[PDB]
Write an enzyme that holds these catalytic residues in place. Structure first.
Site, PDB file in Angstrom:
ATOM      1  N   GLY A  67     -40.781 -39.008 -58.372  1.00 47.76           N
ATOM      2  CA  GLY A  67     -40.302 -37.621 -58.341  1.00 47.76           C
ATOM      3  C   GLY A  67     -38.862 -37.537 -58.104  1.00 47.76           C
ATOM      4  O   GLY A  67     -38.113 -38.467 -57.988  1.00 47.76           O
ATOM      5  N   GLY A  94     -19.630 -22.989 -42.554  1.00 46.03           N
ATOM      6  CA  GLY A  94     -18.305 -22.651 -42.298  1.00 46.03           C
ATOM      7  C   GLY A  94     -17.537 -23.520 -41.535  1.00 46.03           C
ATOM      8  O   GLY A  94     -17.305 -24.875 -42.024  1.00 46.03           O
ATOM      9  N   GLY A  95     -16.989 -23.511 -40.374  1.00 47.96           N
ATOM     10  CA  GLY A  95     -16.393 -24.278 -39.637  1.00 47.96           C
ATOM     11  C   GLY A  95     -15.045 -23.981 -39.768  1.00 47.96           C
ATOM     12  O   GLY A  95     -14.634 -23.166 -40.747  1.00 47.96           O
ATOM     13  N   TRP A  96     -14.224 -24.354 -38.979  1.00 50.37           N
ATOM     14  CA  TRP A  96     -12.788 -24.088 -39.171  1.00 50.37           C
ATOM     15  C   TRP A  96     -11.830 -24.131 -40.353  1.00 50.37           C
ATOM     16  O   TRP A  96     -11.364 -23.416 -40.768  1.00 50.37           O
ATOM     17  CB  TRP A  96     -11.670 -25.078 -37.922  1.00 50.37           C
ATOM     18  CG  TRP A  96     -10.683 -24.197 -37.497  1.00 50.37           C
ATOM     19  CD1 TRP A  96      -9.352 -24.128 -38.004  1.00 50.37           C
ATOM     20  CD2 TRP A  96     -10.527 -23.445 -36.287  1.00 50.37           C
ATOM     21  NE1 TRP A  96      -8.781 -23.358 -37.102  1.00 50.37           N
ATOM     22  CE2 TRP A  96      -9.403 -22.860 -36.082  1.00 50.37           C
ATOM     23  CE3 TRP A  96     -11.729 -23.228 -35.280  1.00 50.37           C
ATOM     24  CZ2 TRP A  96      -9.159 -22.013 -34.987  1.00 50.37           C
ATOM     25  CZ3 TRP A  96     -11.419 -22.440 -34.263  1.00 50.37           C
ATOM     26  CH2 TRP A  96     -10.143 -21.866 -33.969  1.00 50.37           C
ATOM     27  N   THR A  97     -12.218 -25.357 -40.988  1.00 49.40           N
ATOM     28  CA  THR A  97     -11.840 -25.513 -42.404  1.00 49.40           C
ATOM     29  C   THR A  97     -12.299 -24.588 -43.463  1.00 49.40           C
ATOM     30  O   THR A  97     -11.573 -23.961 -44.317  1.00 49.40           O
ATOM     31  CB  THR A  97     -12.013 -26.933 -42.965  1.00 49.40           C
ATOM     32  OG1 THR A  97     -11.307 -27.897 -41.909  1.00 49.40           O
ATOM     33  CG2 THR A  97     -11.209 -27.465 -44.186  1.00 49.40           C
ATOM     34  N   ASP A 132     -26.853 -21.853 -38.902  1.00 49.04           N
ATOM     35  CA  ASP A 132     -25.890 -21.735 -37.852  1.00 49.04           C
ATOM     36  C   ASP A 132     -24.737 -21.320 -38.614  1.00 49.04           C
ATOM     37  O   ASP A 132     -24.186 -22.115 -39.405  1.00 49.04           O
ATOM     38  CB  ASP A 132     -25.770 -23.030 -36.794  1.00 49.04           C
ATOM     39  CG  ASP A 132     -24.436 -22.637 -35.994  1.00 49.04           C
ATOM     40  OD1 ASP A 132     -23.364 -23.610 -36.213  1.00 49.04           O
ATOM     41  OD2 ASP A 132     -24.258 -21.819 -35.227  1.00 49.04           O
ATOM     42  N   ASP A 134     -20.662 -20.579 -38.431  1.00 51.82           N
ATOM     43  CA  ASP A 134     -19.532 -20.777 -37.760  1.00 51.82           C
ATOM     44  C   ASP A 134     -18.244 -19.893 -38.585  1.00 51.82           C
ATOM     45  O   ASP A 134     -17.706 -20.515 -39.514  1.00 51.82           O
ATOM     46  CB  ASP A 134     -19.044 -22.127 -37.647  1.00 51.82           C
ATOM     47  CG  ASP A 134     -20.287 -22.896 -36.867  1.00 51.82           C
ATOM     48  OD1 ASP A 134     -21.022 -22.217 -36.520  1.00 51.82           O
ATOM     49  OD2 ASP A 134     -20.062 -23.870 -36.316  1.00 51.82           O
ATOM     50  N   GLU A 136     -14.645 -18.577 -38.011  1.00 54.13           N
ATOM     51  CA  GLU A 136     -13.414 -18.635 -37.121  1.00 54.13           C
ATOM     52  C   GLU A 136     -12.342 -18.096 -37.980  1.00 54.13           C
ATOM     53  O   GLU A 136     -11.718 -18.906 -38.767  1.00 54.13           O
ATOM     54  CB  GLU A 136     -13.459 -20.098 -36.683  1.00 54.13           C
ATOM     55  CG  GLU A 136     -14.372 -20.526 -35.722  1.00 54.13           C
ATOM     56  CD  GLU A 136     -14.877 -22.002 -35.999  1.00 54.13           C
ATOM     57  OE1 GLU A 136     -14.637 -22.761 -35.392  1.00 54.13           O
ATOM     58  OE2 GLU A 136     -15.450 -22.064 -37.110  1.00 54.13           O
ATOM     59  N   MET A 202     -17.955 -21.599 -27.773  1.00 49.33           N
ATOM     60  CA  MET A 202     -16.948 -22.543 -27.828  1.00 49.33           C
ATOM     61  C   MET A 202     -16.010 -22.339 -26.681  1.00 49.33           C
ATOM     62  O   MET A 202     -14.857 -21.920 -26.974  1.00 49.33           O
ATOM     63  CB  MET A 202     -16.371 -22.439 -29.315  1.00 49.33           C
ATOM     64  CG  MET A 202     -17.373 -22.613 -30.656  1.00 49.33           C
ATOM     65  SD  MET A 202     -16.428 -22.463 -32.008  1.00 49.33           S
ATOM     66  CE  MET A 202     -15.984 -20.815 -32.157  1.00 49.33           C
ATOM     67  N   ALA A 203     -16.533 -22.946 -25.511  1.00 48.51           N
ATOM     68  CA  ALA A 203     -15.571 -22.784 -24.412  1.00 48.51           C
ATOM     69  C   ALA A 203     -14.824 -24.047 -24.325  1.00 48.51           C
ATOM     70  O   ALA A 203     -14.989 -24.819 -23.374  1.00 48.51           O
ATOM     71  CB  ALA A 203     -16.365 -22.636 -22.978  1.00 48.51           C
ATOM     72  N   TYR A 204     -14.031 -24.057 -25.367  1.00 47.82           N
ATOM     73  CA  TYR A 204     -12.993 -25.332 -25.378  1.00 47.82           C
ATOM     74  C   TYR A 204     -11.623 -25.020 -26.282  1.00 47.82           C
ATOM     75  O   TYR A 204     -11.573 -23.875 -26.607  1.00 47.82           O
ATOM     76  CB  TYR A 204     -13.403 -26.537 -26.074  1.00 47.82           C
ATOM     77  CG  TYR A 204     -14.774 -26.549 -26.862  1.00 47.82           C
ATOM     78  CD1 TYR A 204     -14.256 -26.372 -28.249  1.00 47.82           C
ATOM     79  CD2 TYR A 204     -15.838 -26.356 -26.575  1.00 47.82           C
ATOM     80  CE1 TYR A 204     -15.004 -26.225 -29.232  1.00 47.82           C
ATOM     81  CE2 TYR A 204     -16.952 -26.402 -27.753  1.00 47.82           C
ATOM     82  CZ  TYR A 204     -16.481 -26.169 -28.936  1.00 47.82           C
ATOM     83  OH  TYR A 204     -17.286 -26.330 -30.109  1.00 47.82           O
ATOM     84  N   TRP A 343     -19.328 -30.774 -28.987  1.00 47.54           N
ATOM     85  CA  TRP A 343     -18.588 -31.143 -30.188  1.00 47.54           C
ATOM     86  C   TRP A 343     -17.738 -32.329 -29.631  1.00 47.54           C
ATOM     87  O   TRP A 343     -16.827 -32.306 -29.175  1.00 47.54           O
ATOM     88  CB  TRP A 343     -17.546 -29.802 -30.352  1.00 47.54           C
ATOM     89  CG  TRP A 343     -16.623 -30.207 -31.553  1.00 47.54           C
ATOM     90  CD1 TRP A 343     -15.539 -30.958 -31.383  1.00 47.54           C
ATOM     91  CD2 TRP A 343     -16.911 -30.027 -33.035  1.00 47.54           C
ATOM     92  NE1 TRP A 343     -15.043 -31.197 -32.631  1.00 47.54           N
ATOM     93  CE2 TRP A 343     -15.962 -30.597 -33.559  1.00 47.54           C
ATOM     94  CE3 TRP A 343     -17.790 -29.407 -33.712  1.00 47.54           C
ATOM     95  CZ2 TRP A 343     -15.396 -30.661 -35.035  1.00 47.54           C
ATOM     96  CZ3 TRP A 343     -17.580 -29.433 -35.145  1.00 47.54           C
ATOM     97  CH2 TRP A 343     -16.688 -29.963 -35.762  1.00 47.54           C
TER      98      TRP A 343
END
Length: 392
Positions: A67, A94-97, A132, A134, A136, A202-204, A343
């Site tokens: 299969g 998503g993500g930054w890029t 999720d 993301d 940005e 995203m505390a960074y 991360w």
């Protein structure tokens, strides 16, 4: 409820970094975000690396199975879920890029419903416990409002899917959110929270190469005596979220497993020129590569921030030590937050010096983590091996 231990697994990490899913210490996490899927202008969500995600064969993957079948990191993610029923996986989009690809499809009902439909399809086929998002970052009012509509669309898609499977599990919807005021002040927090299971703060990246002065990039509290060393603080963001109507137990505190460097500097809070090298990219260093030879480590317990400084090179590196990881853990417990997020999975140390291990233990150990069984049943998957539960 219990605390959540969330980590991002980056798909490109299997290459140069040599980091595979099987290297993950499953027992220390409750959620793994598989990053990152891309978005087509129509709204259609799709896997970014077919080789890494679904085609690559790892030891134990056969060539002649009957299969349609999936391999790659996707299969490895399911295998972890089989061994740890308390381990959930989410498809991170998503993500930054890939962030610039949200605006268009989010601007209309068609694109949003398409986004909701395709993401759900991937979730049900690939064996994820949820999704999720993301983005940005939403630039203005319109985008801000479309984001709420997008979340509403996804929540309904996930719910409709559960309805068709009464005795199955419920699925998750989460997002990575900004800790910078100028970014979150334009978000309809209270309205968004209605559709979310939890928020990954995203505390960074509070400071970096874009600055004129060196600073702490992920501190909890601001510095009173030396204001310039702390342009931001996670505490400021946590309070504002709570004041916006978001429940503290739904806010997961993000933490970095890397450090940001500053060259030609006298120290923290002073001007710098350049960022020097890095573990892979200039200005960024994996936590596992710390500390560098010739550097003195300074730990500011009160504001929960640490850094290394080489007096000879006049090179500064802002990163968290186990001690500082312990302080953030205390902050999470004290304020009844939803847990911790990191991360990313490739750059942590193994054993006694692990930042994640330190937090988890600081949270009270595995026993204090959220207990909520994952979903293994995917009867609608197009893949035979997956729907048969990866038996082999």
């Amino acid at each position: 409820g219990g605390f959540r231990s969330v980590v991002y697994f980056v798909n490109w990490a299997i290459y140069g970094r040599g980091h595979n899913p099987q290297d993950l210490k499953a027992d220390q996490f409750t959620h793994i975000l598989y990053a990152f899927a891309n978005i087509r202008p129509s709204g259609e969500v799709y896997l970014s690396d077919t080789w890494a995600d679904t085609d690559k064969h790892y030891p134990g993957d056969k060539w002649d199975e009957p299969g349609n079948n999936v391999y790659g990191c996707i299969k490895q993610m399911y295998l972890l879920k089989k061994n740890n029923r308390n381990l959930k996986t989410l498809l991170s989009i998503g993500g930054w890029t890939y962030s610039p690809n949200f605006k268009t499809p989010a601007s209309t009902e068609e694109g949003r419903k398409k986004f909701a439909d395709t993401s759900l399809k991937l979730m049900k086929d690939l064996g994820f416990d949820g999704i999720d998002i993301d983005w940005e970052y939403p630039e203005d009012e319109k985008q801000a409002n479309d984001f709420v509509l997008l979340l509403k669309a996804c929540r309904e898609a996930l719910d409709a899917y559960s309805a068709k499977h009464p005795n199955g599990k419920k699925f998750l919807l989460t997002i990575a959110s900004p800790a910078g005021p100028q970014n979150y002040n334009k978000l309809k927090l209270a309205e968004m929270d209605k559709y979310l299971d939890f928020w990954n703060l995203m505390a960074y990246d509070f400071s970096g190469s874009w600055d004129k002065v060196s600073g702490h990039m992920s501190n909890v509290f601001p510095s009173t005596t030396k204001p310039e060393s702390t342009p931001f603080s996670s505490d400021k963001a946590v309070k504002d979220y709570i004041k916006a109507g978001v429940p503290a137990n739904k806010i997961v505190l993000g933490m970095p497993l890397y450090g940001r460097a500053f060259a030609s500097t006298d120290g923290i809070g002073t001007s710098f020129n350049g960022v020097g090298g890095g573990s892979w990219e200039n200005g960024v260093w994996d936590y596992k590569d710390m500390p560098q030879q010739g550097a003195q480590v300074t730990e500011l317990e009160d504001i929960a921030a640490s850094y290394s400084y080489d007096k000879n090179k006049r090179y500064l590196i802002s990163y968290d030590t186990v001690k500082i990881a312990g302080k953030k853990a205390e902050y999470i417990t004290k304020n009844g937050m939803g847990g911790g997020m990191w991360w990313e999975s490739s750059s942590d140390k193994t054993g006694n010096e692990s930042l994640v291990g330190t937090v988890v233990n600081g949270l009270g150990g595995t026993g204090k983590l959220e207990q909520r069984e994952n979903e293994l049943s995917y009867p609608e998957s197009v893949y035979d091996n997956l729907k048969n539960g990866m038996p082999s």
